[PDB]
Amino acid sequence: MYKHTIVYDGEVDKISATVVGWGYNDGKILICDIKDYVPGQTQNLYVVGGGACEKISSITKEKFIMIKGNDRFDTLYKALDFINR
Amino acid sequence: MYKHTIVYDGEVDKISATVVGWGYNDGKILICDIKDYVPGQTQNLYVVGGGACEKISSITKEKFIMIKGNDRFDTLYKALDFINR
């Protein structure tokens, strides 16, 4: 169903998650809160921000890439770095 | 009356406008689409993105600061720079 799914927890980390999705235009992408994440329907899973990174392993067995800093700003810079922007 | 109002045009410049809002916790803040902007109820006006920056002068006669780059990423970095992050 999706090529890239980017998960976050909360309206702050949503920003960073959204910017990670700005790095991809090669397929269908889903940006969604961890509380709405449905496992098993994505090729790639990216988890953004500390909150989502602590909860994700209890929600899915899929492999994933973590994008996380110490605060909302650091996370945002790491997101930008991850997509080479 | 709002201490800070941040205006944007569209869901992409919304993201940078949200980031500018992360820089302010000293007062009441409105983040809103340029279509919904109501002049005369803010101490500080900040206009995010090329879209809003072209429409705003025909909507209000208030002074404002422009936060805009050539693409969405440039706009986002300028948002971060505007709040010293």
Numbering used by the authors:
A (entry chain F), B (entry chain A): 186 to 270
What's written in the study?
When crystallization trials for full length CD27L endolysin were set up, crystals appeared overnight from freshly purified protein. An X-ray data set to 2.3 Ångstrom was collected from a fresh crystal, and it was realized that the crystal most likely contained the C-terminal portion of the endolysin, because molecular replacement with the previously determined crystal structure of the catalytic domain was not successful. The structure was used as a model to solve the structure of the full-length CD27L crystals by molecular replacement. It was found that the “full length” construct had been proteolyzed and the crystal contained six copies of the C-terminal portion of CD27L alone. The refined structure shows clear electron density for all six monomers of the C-terminal domain with a Matthews coefficient of 2.3, and there is no space in the crystal lattice for an additional N-terminal domain. The C-terminal portion of CD27L consists of a platform of four parallel beta strands, flanked by an alpha helix with two additional alpha helices mounted on top. The autolytic fragment of the C-terminal domain starts at the end of the linker at methionine M186, which is still integrated in the C-terminal domain. The proteolytic fragments of CD27L form a mixture of dimers within the crystal lattice. All six molecules are engaged in one common dimerization mode, where the alpha helices α1 and α3 from one molecule stack on their symmetry mate from a second molecule. The dimerization is such that the N-termini of both monomers are pointing away from the dimer interface, and we term this dimerization mode a ‘head-on’ dimer. An alternative dimerization mode is found among the six C-terminal domains present in the crystal structure of the proteolytic fragment of CD27L endolysin, between two molecules that are each involved in separate head-on dimers as well.
Endolysins are produced by many double stranded DNA bacteriophages to effect the release of new virions from an infected cell by degrading the bacterial cell wall. Endolysins typically consist of a peptidoglycan hydrolase domain and a C-terminal domain that is often termed as a cell wall binding domain. Here, we present the crystal structures of autoproteolytic fragments of the CD27L and CTP1L endolysins, covering the C-terminal domain. We propose that the cleavage and oligomerization are linked, and they provide the endolysin with a trigger and release mechanism that leads to activation.
